[PDB]
């Protein structure tokens, strides 16, 4: 294949065997697509009908004014431009917001039952709420700090049926309650009573009868009960002896009465089970009437009201059983018709027929009052008024929130035809809940699952932001409704009609005070990706941590390809916080989908369909590693399928779908682990979390054994700058890269120049270093998509989270006892695991009521050694080495009424120091932290007095902008000299001079923009920063610290093997081989058999062959070998072992020698998660680099010189350095400040508090005999004013016995009980 500019420098050996039909899509597509639907920047006059920002204005604005003749009409909205750019926004503290101006008109009427004599006044209203306008990486810059808004996995609105059999029913078979869950509020319920009844309820009401809800809506009680279970009519010619023989109801019912039908034969004996042969006789016989007894119809109740034509009145009401006295009336009245209900115990029991007689609610008038009894008993509403009142209360569209997705899930579960149901409840839907709830008792079908991915909906930032904007709009209309009704249009303007405060305040709290909008952890480019693919089950309006349990914290068979099962955080919330898969994608309704390949019995089709969770149970899905016959046919008689969420084995003639890639099940962080199939699921879950906490080291080193997904994480994270358009690089600087756009990829009719400014050393959210280094040279061509400069922890476009060290697996003198890491001194002298940390220290100047706070250079009671580092303004210089305790900025506060002690003024006269009425409150560095001042930022009020340093920093910024504008015009000036000269020498004098006016018109129009851009930056430098009220000046400095690795730091690998370095041994003590090459890290082999992670050793065996091949390339390159011998050895590595590669496409003298120089340190290899190298392919490369195929060699002891009596596994393993350094873990305290009420230790004076002595440690001392050790830690070490001060005097004097006194926690308890009117004293 053809290689780009970046791929020609270094190629990874890919061991993949399965072909890829679809590559991995954009990782951050879930954050960008959901926001473009909400915020529609690029659109025509006709907007979209989505649920974003346009749906909010289309639902709150068009409302007429009550008790008036006015109405507001929404026309459209437009988005302006942000005041500041992206990078210049994180340092000023702005929100990078954009205003929106909605054009709303005001209409007037005459209230004459006709909209006449109107006057439209279209006015572009001022900005209501500034939208944060997230960047291109999926982050929101809120108050200078970029944040992400994770998606929420909430339950979809609809109906849910289950068993819910527990201890309440005290039996196996139980009926569950169908709790209808709307979108917001107006909850409903329907519980089935155990006594063959149904008792509906509400969110806060008690059990309500279901019989009164049928007649109050308008339906008759006789017709609703006859259509529930069954309906049977019988004719009577003066004698009620007849039964309508039902071919379905008579099958399975015993007949206790002997019948003689059949013209001389018997059908059923006295109490005999009828068979299928005798049942089918009634069909071909054609008979319908039969002589039935009178004692068998006493159990069968009537369905509809029986009216006699002779009497003229209803002789029998509905739902009435037959008695002995009621039988003589039928013989006397001689009714021509009879309607009874035919129910049995084998079929479904008529629970609606028995519940109809509950509370005597069958009539239409008596049922409308029973509902009002549960909603509002004894309210001001009348009997008939409450019926019409309640009929419109829950029918309100604003009260009963039912989304479009909820209406689809409502009709699809009950089996209705109309999928897009209305927002209000329909009478046809109330009848499906009755037939489906009673069916779940007898077990004639299936139930629903509340944990399946079909019942869970993914809510992104586009919906969470539109809901807050909708709430902000209904808060404006409620306040502007009374102002418009009592006024007119000719006296005011549409701007003064409504207020824009509730809208700006509703979106201000969603991005700054919501648990979904959290600070993005950018200590690693991988952590930024996994934070945006994160799907959280917590949040507002969702399932919390306490009500989780154990049924939701597990995996489901529907999580295959949608949610990674080995990426849950271990702790209090495991299984609630999930991460999206690699190929996963949300549907239109908000459900997760995964791609599949349509496979037939003759050819696997090339089309790819994205299937949801509910559509997966129909088809048959096979694995992606199924064998093929090079023609699209499966060559295996037994394939693995999951057609019905069951991992079974079936025939290749029944498969219908096929997976795209084996990596579609794991997430992004879980796919970066080589040999994942060999590690346990418990270690793989821990290996994907520790890989996220890696700190970017000083030098980025690629992993010799990788997967292949590393070039996709670094490209989609955005930490490295890529080329927008192709062209030739003009000039490369350490701070910026400018490229010359090619002649073909230009949109306009000019040359075009792209300038990329590289980010230098800046502070991250985790106090880490972030900087970019150029990778291109001067004079090389690049294409669209090439990496020009890599970011933090990236090696030439790949992902380099750590470094690969020479690891030996053996016990070494107990230093690697359990999980400790025996380190060498070479990894410390070579600065391998050294990291740079940037710390920010701010000093604010407030306005004390006694006097303002100003930054000065005069400090009382100090010397010259403390003021030499400051300047004439009072701030340290950039680049000064500050130790622990140095003064950064000068700040003094005026004091009054000091009341100096007369014993103190005698001591000040000894030296002669003058008395100054100013308290020293300067900003100093904390104890134990040292660094270098790298940047100082000064912020002041708009128009306030600035010091000398404020303009000094301003002068440097005004020159760097001027130096960039001069470089922009310098490159475009040379393009006008080569284009005009080439056409003058090559091939009418009037036409030659006419084109000069057009060429000079473009260089003059660009020059005008340079002046507008220069005056824009000069104006922004003069704009004072708006801060909190009560602050005068804010000065913040930045300290850079280079922390090396020391015994105590936590290191880990990619296979879930963490540890803490214990000792740093010299090079002479480390075990070495016969050649004298010492190892770098000694690991303990006892951990591998305990936690089954074989991929830890397979990476070590493959890493030895990767480094061994680089030593052969180096030896071949140093011996001045010809090019024909280099490409021959490169073909033996890529095109001989496995996988598939391609050579003979690059130039030997310039592009092959450049490739062999990057492979000098080692040949990187790609091992996918489930499509990697085997044990045979690993040993094939071990014998190629002249290494043992076993991967083990006999080492020598460095201290004694003797050779080890057993071969030891050696190799190169990729190690990571986690953010668990001991510089923030080591703490100690003797004395310090105490609290106000309870005299207990605490922090706040640049020092931590103490160690909390809980009750578990008290029981440990009580289990011992230490009575004086327990009393000492409870009285003299805390809560004793006279105990701590007198014990400190004893330790200095020499003796120490005890000072018990009385704890302050008990002295306060006595004063609090006495204040409650309860006397408590000490009897003694």
């Amino acid at each position: 294949m053809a290689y780009s500019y970046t791929e020609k420098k270094r190629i990874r050996k890919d061991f993949s065997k399965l072909p890829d039909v679809m590559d991995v899509p954009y990782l951050l597509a879930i954050q960008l697509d959901s926001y473009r639907e909400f915020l529609q920047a690029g659109a025509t006059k006709e907007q979209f009908r989505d649920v974003g920002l346009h749906a909010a204005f289309k639902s709150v604005f068009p409302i007429i004014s009550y008790s008036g003749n006015a109405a507001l009409e929404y026309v459209g909205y437009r988005l302006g431009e942000p005041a500041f750019d992206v990078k210049e926004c994180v340092l000023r503290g702005v929100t990078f917001a954009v205003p929106l101006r909605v054009k709303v008109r005001l209409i007037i009427f005459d209230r004459e039952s006709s909209n006449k004599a109107i006057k439209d006044i279209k006015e572009q209203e001022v900005y209501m709420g500034e939208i944060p306008l997230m960047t291109e990486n999926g982050t929101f810059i809120i108050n200078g700090t970029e944040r992400v808004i994770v998606s929420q996995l909430h339950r979809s609105p609809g109906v849910f049926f289950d068993h819910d059999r527990g201890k309440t029913h005290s039996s196996g078979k139980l009926l569950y309650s169908a709790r209808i869950i709307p979108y917001r509020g107006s909850w409903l319920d329907f519980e089935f009573d155990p006594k063959d009844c149904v008792f509906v309820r509400i969110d806060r009401r008690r059990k309500l009868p279901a019989s009164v809800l049928l007649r109050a809506l308008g339906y008759s009680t006789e017709e609703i009960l006859n259509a529930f279970y069954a309906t049977n009519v019988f004719h009577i010619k003066g004698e009620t002896l007849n039964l309508e023989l039902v071919p379905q109801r008579l099958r399975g019912e015993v007949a206790s009465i002997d019948i003689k039908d059949g013209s001389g034969k018997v059908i059923v004996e006295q109490g005999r089970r009828i068979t299928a042969r005798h049942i089918n006789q009634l069909e071909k016989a054609g008979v319908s009437q039969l002589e039935v007894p009178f004692d068998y119809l006493i159990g069968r109740t009537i369905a509809k009201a029986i009216v006699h034509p002779a009497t003229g009145e209803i002789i029998a009401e509905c739902n009435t059983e037959l008695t002995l006295d009621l039988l003589a009336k039928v013989a006397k009245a001689q009714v021509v018709r009879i309607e009874t209900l035919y129910t049995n115990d084998i079929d479904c029991g008529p629970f609606i027929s028995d519940t109809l007689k509950i509370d005597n609610t069958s009539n239409q008038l008596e049922a409308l009052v029973e509902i009002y009894r549960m909603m509002r008993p004894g309210e001001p509403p009348t009997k008939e008024a409450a019926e019409t009142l309640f009929g419109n209360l829950f029918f309100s569209a604003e009260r009963y929130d039912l989304s479009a997705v909820g209406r689809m899930k409502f009709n699809r579960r009950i089996g209705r035809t109309e999928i897009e149901g209305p927002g209000v409840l329909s009478k046809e839907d109330i009848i499906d809940v009755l037939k489906t709830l009673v069916d779940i008792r007898n077990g004639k079908g299936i139930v629903d699952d509340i944990d399946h991915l079909g019942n869970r909906r993914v809510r992104c930032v586009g919906e969470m932001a539109e809901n807050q904007f909708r709430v902000g709009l209904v808060r404006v209309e409620r306040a502007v409704k009374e102002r418009l009704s009592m006024a007119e249009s000719e006296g005011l303007m549409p701007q003064d009609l409504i207020n824009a405060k509730p809208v700006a305040a509703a979106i201000k709290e969603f991005f700054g005070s919501s648990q979904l909008s959290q600070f993005m952890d950018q200590n690693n480019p991988l952590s930024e990706i996994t934070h945006k693919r994160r799907v959280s089950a917590l949040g507002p309006g969702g399932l919390t941590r306490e009500r989780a349990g154990f049924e939701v914290r597990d995996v489901h068979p529907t999580h295959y390809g949608r949610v990674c099962p080995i990426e849950t955080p271990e702790g209090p919330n495991i299984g609630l916080i999930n991460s999206l898969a690699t190929y996963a994608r949300t549907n239109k309704y908000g459900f997760l989908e995964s791609p599949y390949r349509v496979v037939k019995d003759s050819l696997v089709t090339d089309e790819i369909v994205f299937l949801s969770a509910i559509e997966e149970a129909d088809h048959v899905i096979a694995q992606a590693s199924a064998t093929l016959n090079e023609k699209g046919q499966l060559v295996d008689e037994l394939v693995a399928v999951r057609h019905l969420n069951e991992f079974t084995v079936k025939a290749p003639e029944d498969v219908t779908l096929m997976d795209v890639s084996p990596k579609q099940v794991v997430s992004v962080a879980a796919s970066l682990i080589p040999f994942l199939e060999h590690d346990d699921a418990n270690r793989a879950l821990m290996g994907s979390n520790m890989q996220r906490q890696a700190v970017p080291t000083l030098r980025a080193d690629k992993p010799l054994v990788g997967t292949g997904m590393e070039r996709n994480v670094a490209r989609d994270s955005g930490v490295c700058v890529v080329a927008r358009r192709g062209g030739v690089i003009d000039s490369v600087d350490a701070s910026r890269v400018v490229v010359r756009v090619a002649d073909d990829e230009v949109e306009t009719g000019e040359a075009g120049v792209d300038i990329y400014n590289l980010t230098k050393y800046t502070r991250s959210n985790q106090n880490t270093c972030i900087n970019q280094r150029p990778l291109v040279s001067k004079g090389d061509v690049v294409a669209r998509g090439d990496i020009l400069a890599d970011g933090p922890s990236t090696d030439m476009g790949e992902l380099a989270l750590g470094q690969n060290m020479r690891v030996a697996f053996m016990p070494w003198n107990g230093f690697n006892f359990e999980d400790s890491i025996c380190l060498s001194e070479r990894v410390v002298q070579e600065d391998r695991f050294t990291t740079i940390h940037i710390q920010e220290l701010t000093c604010v100047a407030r306005d004390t009521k006694l006097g303002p706070e100003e930054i000065t250079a005069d400090i009382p009671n100090v010397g010259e050694a403390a003021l030499n580092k400051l300047d004439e303004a009072g701030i340290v210089y950039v680049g000064a080495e500050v130790q622990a305790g140095d003064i950064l900025v000068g700040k003094v506060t005026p004091k009054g009424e000091t009341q100096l002690t007369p014993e103190e003024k005698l001591l000040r006269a000894i030296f002669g120091e003058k008395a100054s009425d100013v308290k020293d409150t300067s900003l100093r560095v904390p104890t134990g932290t040292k660094g270098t001042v790298i940047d100082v930022q000064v912020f002041t009020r708009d128009g306030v007095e600035r010091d000398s340093r404020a303009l000094s920093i301003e002068k440097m910024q005004l020159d760097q902008i001027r130096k960039d504008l001069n470089e922009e015009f310098r490159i475009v000036e040379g393009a006008t000299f080569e284009r005009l000269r080439a056409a003058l020498v090559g091939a009418a004098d009037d036409a030659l001079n006419e084109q000069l006016e057009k060429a000079q018109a473009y260089i003059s129009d660009r020059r005008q923009l340079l002046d507008d851009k220069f005056e824009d930056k000069k104006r922004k430098l003069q704009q004072g920063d708006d801060l909190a009220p009560g602050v005068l000046k804010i000065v913040k400095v930045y300290l850079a610290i280079k922390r090396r690795i020391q015994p105590g730091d936590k290191m880990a690998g990619r296979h879930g093997n963490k540890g803490v370095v214990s000792v740093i041994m010299p090079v002479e003590d480390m075990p070495h081989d016969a050649n004298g090459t010492p190892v770098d890290i000694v690991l303990n082999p006892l951990g591998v058999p305990s936690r089954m992670n074989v991929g830890q050793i397979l990476e070590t065996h493959l890493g030895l062959a990767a480094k061994g091949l680089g030593e052969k390339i180096n030896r071949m390159l140093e011996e001045q070998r010809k090019v024909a011998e280099l490409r021959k050895f490169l073909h033996e590595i890529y095109n001989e072992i496995g996988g598939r590669e391609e050579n003979l496409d690059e130039l030997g003298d310039n592009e092959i020698l450049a490739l062999a120089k990057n492979l000098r340190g080692g040949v990187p290899m790609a091992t996918p998660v489930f499509d990697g190298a085997k044990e045979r392919e690993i040993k094939a490369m071990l014998k190629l680099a002249d290494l043992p195929e076993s991967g083990q060699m006999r080492l020598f002891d460095g201290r004694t010189g003797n050779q080890f009596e057993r071969p030891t596994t050696v190799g190169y393993m990729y190690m990571l350095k986690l953010n668990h350094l001991v510089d923030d873990k080591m703490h100690a305290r003797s004395t310090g400040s105490y609290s106000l009420v309870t005299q207990q230790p605490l922090g706040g004076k640049a020092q931590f508090g103490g160690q909390r002595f809980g009750e578990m440690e008290v029981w440990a001392l009580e289990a011992y005999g230490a009575a004086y050790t327990l009393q000492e830690m409870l009285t003299v070490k805390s809560d004793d004013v006279n105990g701590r001060t007198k014990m400190y005097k004893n330790i200095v004097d020499g003796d120490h016995r005890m000072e018990a006194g009385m704890p302050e926690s008990f002295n306060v308890l006595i004063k609090e009980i006495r204040s409650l009117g309860i006397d408590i004293e000490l009897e003694t």
């Binding site: 597990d554 295959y560 849950t568 495991i574 992606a624 069951e646 991992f647 997976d659 099940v665 199939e677 590690d679 699921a681 053996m810 016990p811 107990g814 006892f817 936590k1050 803490v1060 006892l1086 058999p1089 305990s1090 992670n1093 050793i1097 397979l1098 065996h1101 489930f1170 044990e1175 076993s1190 083990q1192 002891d1197 009596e1205 057993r1206 030891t1208 510089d1223 873990k1225 080591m1226 703490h1227 100690a1228 305290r1229 310090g1232 230790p1241 508090g1249 160690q1251 909390r1252 009750e1255 440690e1257 009580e1262 289990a1263 011992y1264 230490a1266 050790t1269 000492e1272 003299v1276 070490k1277 805390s1278 200095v1292 005890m1298 926690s1305 609090e1312 409650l1316």
Partner: protein, 554 residues
């Protein structure tokens, strides 16, 4: 109290006390104006709920709620509601002379001592240095002695080394489940920021080296210093308080060096030679002229404590290996030689320390458990044991059992399509079938893993015990059991389900050969089921041990 910027902050009882005084003075003024009973009965009613809301909240009198979300914090709410002052102190209280840092293994420390950084010792023992500088004459006042510690003068380190010589410190881990969670050690000054912990006390503390932290505490009075040495010392609590078995036993790394040392081989270098004493055995092994484990005959002088008060010595010629003779050099005098003639597994060493504690006492046992740690760490490094890709040997007869069991299920699936068996009858047929084939592979794997090492004695092919790395770690009891080696070499078997059922298709692959995409997704069901179960194991068991203390504390 005021705050930064002139803002004040008060408590929830000032407005409650002010509301009662505002209504009490209003009632006192309403009585002298001869007001009728219609207006004075309502003011006396307001004074009722005014004092009632001050005492307690949540009763029939609703508490005042103005410009605040939480209702209020009354007088009774200060001693109840899971946050009262009486209950908040029973669950924790900050103390002085304390600190914390990560733990680190120290293999050169004794059982009664631990490592303490110099930066922590200067802060923990600060008052003891101020009193030692004035008594020695280096400082006149306490204000001048404090400035000497900030400058870190060289003479301060000589003072700090003397104030911690016989002063023990207490170390405790955050989860204190039993009595051994707090033990006293003699701190030594080490360079670094990590607390150096003894490898043998890691079993009682239940502490691994994955970044765990351990808090420190300093006993001040000599009454508390004697309780840390006589009661809370690490050498005193060598036995478990729940059983009679030793809690300080050699862990996986120490028991691995003692198992390889005492492991008899068939044919080795220096086999059959005789030694006059145990000192000749070490002299022959250090010269490289004798293997670590070879059948030899050494004359040994041992003493017997079986006789009451008679420590009689006996000289006999035994037939043992070279490694077992070197291990007898650290055994005390009261024990015979038959206690070290075995293979020295983990269960055999714990029974030797328990027998040594009941014979020679405690002083000769705390110095004997330290010698086993030094001898286990020394001989586990000489033998560079390592796990490789060829250590997980696969039995050649595993394919003959999997392919045979797969054909026995195909003949059953044909009977399911013919109507001979039902769904429940076929379920119990395929579940019990794979469970039989899983035990057949496990017994065929351990037979090939344990008796594979072959040797040559004067010309032969004799089968001995396997000298394999994966077999040694499971036989010695260091780390791993039969259920874990089964998943590395043999088949994994049938996996469970969070619902409680067993899947029909088992995992016929191991971790060496690798799993498929569907076989790996099935194993994730029981993985997160066991991880989420640990969250309940710390919440339910902690509630049980708390209820048991509240009953049997007196």
């Amino acid at each position: 109290v005021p705050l930064d910027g002139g803002r004040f902050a008060t408590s929830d009882l000032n407005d409650l006390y002010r509301r009662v005084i505002n209504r009490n003075n209003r009632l006192k003024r309403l009585l002298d104006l001869a007001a009728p009973d219609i207006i004075v009965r309502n003011e006396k009613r307001m004074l009722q709920e005014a004092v009632d809301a001050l005492l307690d909240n949540g009763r029939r009198g609703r508490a005042i709620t103005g410009s605040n979300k939480r209702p209020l914090k009354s007088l009774a709410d200060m001693i109840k509601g899971k946050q009262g002052r009486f209950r908040q102190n029973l669950l924790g209280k900050r103390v002085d002379y304390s600190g914390r840092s990560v733990i680190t293994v120290g293999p050169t420390l004794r059982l009664h001592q631990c490592g303490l950084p110099k930066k922590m010792a200067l802060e923990l023992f600060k008052p003891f240095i101020f009193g030692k500088l004035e008594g020695r004459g280096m400082a006149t006042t306490i204000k001048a002695a404090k400035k000497m510690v900030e400058r870190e003068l060289p003479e301060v380190w000589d003072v700090l080394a003397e104030v911690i010589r016989e002063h023990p410190v207490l170390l405790n881990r955050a989860p204190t489940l039993h009595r051994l969670g707090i033990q006293a050690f003699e701190p030594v000054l080490i360079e670094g920021k990590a607390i150096q912990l003894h490898p043998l006390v890691c079993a009682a503390y239940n502490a691994d080296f994955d970044g765990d932290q351990m808090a420190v505490h300093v006993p001040l009075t000599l009454e508390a210093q004697l309780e840390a040495r006589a009661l809370m010392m690490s050498t005193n609590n060598i036995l478990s308080p729940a059983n009679g078995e030793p809690i300080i036993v050699p862990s996986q790394d120490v028991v691995m060096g003692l198992y390889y040392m005492t492991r008899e081989a068939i044919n080795a270098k220096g086999e059959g030679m005789a030694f006059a004493d145990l000192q000749e055995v070490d002299r022959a092994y250090r010269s490289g002229q004798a293997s670590l484990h070879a059948r030899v005959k050494v004359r040994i002088n041992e003493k017997i404590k079986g006789e009451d008060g008679q420590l009689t010595a006996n000289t006999r010629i035994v037939d043992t290996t070279v490694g077992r003779a070197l291990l007898f050099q650290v055994v005390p005098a009261g024990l015979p030689f038959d206690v070290v003639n075995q293979s020295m597994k983990k269960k055999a060493i714990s029974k030797l320390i328990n027998h040594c504690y009941r014979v020679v006492g405690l002083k000769d046992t705390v110095i004997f458990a330290d010698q086993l740690m030094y001898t286990g760490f020394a001989y586990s490094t000489i033998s560079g044991v390592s796990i490789g890709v060829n250590d997980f040997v696969i039995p050649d007869e595993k394919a003959r059992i999997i392919n045979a069991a797969t054909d026995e299920v195909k003949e059953i699936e044909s009977q399911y399509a013919s109507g001979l068996v039902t769904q429940g009858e076929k379920y119990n047929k395929v579940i019990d079938l794979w469970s039989k084939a899983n035990d057949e592979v496990s017994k065929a794997m351990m037979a090939n893993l344990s008796k594979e090492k072959v040797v040559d004695r004067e010309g032969k092919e004799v089968d001995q015990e396997s000298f394999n790395s994966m077999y040694m770690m499971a036989d010695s009891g260091a780390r791993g059991s039969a259920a874990q080696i089964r998943q590395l070499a043999g088949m994994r078997g049938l996996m469970a389900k969070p619902d409680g059922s067993i899947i029909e298709t088992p995992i016929t692959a191991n971790f060496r050969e690798g799993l498929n995409v569907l076989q790996y997704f099935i194993s994730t069901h029981g993985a997160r089921k066991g991880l989420a179960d640990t969250a309940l194991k710390t919440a339910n068991s902690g509630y049980l041990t708390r209820r048991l203390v509240d009953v049997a504390q007196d």
